[PDB]
């Protein structure tokens, strides 16, 4: 979850829910007639909410990606990234190898110093 796409899905469903809620409120409750003010306030609030939801859906649509970046542009970039990841792997391996050799040398040197110091006693 937590994507712009799930936000857009929930916004569209909230639009449909505001449609059903707006009709079910503004038909069930009203002042009778003449051949109330709370109902008028309800109508204004519902219209404002529907407009805001529409604007948000439009903004999220603008936000997602274009009809450029077709799937082949993703695939070729993926191929190039696999090659460069191989090269980065071998480079990391080389630096680790040099560090390992240096570490084994200094370790053996320190062991020999300790052996001499214990043998002198």
């Amino acid at each position: 979850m937590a994507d712009r796409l799930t936000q857009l899905q929930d916004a569209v469903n909230s639009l449909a829910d505001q449609f059903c809620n707006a009709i079910g409120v503004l038909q069930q409750c009203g002042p009778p007639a003449s051949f109330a003010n709370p109902t008028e306030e309800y109508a204004q609030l519902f219209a404002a909410l529907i407009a805001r939801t529409a604007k948000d859906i439009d903004v999220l649509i603008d936000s997602l990606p274009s009809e450029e970046s077709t799937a082949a542009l993703q695939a070729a970039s993926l191929y190039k990234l696999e090659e460069e990841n191989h090269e980065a792997a071998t480079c990391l391996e080389d630096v680790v190898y040099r560090g390992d050799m240096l570490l084994e040398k200094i370790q053996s040197a320190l062991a020999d110093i300790a052996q001499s110091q214990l043998k002198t006693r």
Partner: protein, 84 residues
């Protein structure tokens, strides 16, 4: 005075090569398994078309769906039916 300074150099290089070998172990595990991308996308669709590995977004306890097979899928499968 040779010993103590050689020891602190040894310790710093030891932690450095240790973290580097951690990342190298993870790279070598990734080297063992290499799958085509469309197989990963297809399997991700089968794993999360119905909410099997990640929960539905509006879930309250008492909802029937579960991340395990469920009683109905068990009682209606080939395993429950065809042997009984």
């Amino acid at each position: 005075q040779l010993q103590k300074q050689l020891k602190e150099a040894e310790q710093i290089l030891a932690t450095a090569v240790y973290q580097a070998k951690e990342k190298l172990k993870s790279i070598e595990k990734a080297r063992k398994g290499a799958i085509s991308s469309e197989e990963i996308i297809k399997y991700a669709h089968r794993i999360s078309a119905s909410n099997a590995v990640c929960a539905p977004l509006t879930w309250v306890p008492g909802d029937p769906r579960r991340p395990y097979p469920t009683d109905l899928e068990m009682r209606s499968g080939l395993l429950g039916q065809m042997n009984n």
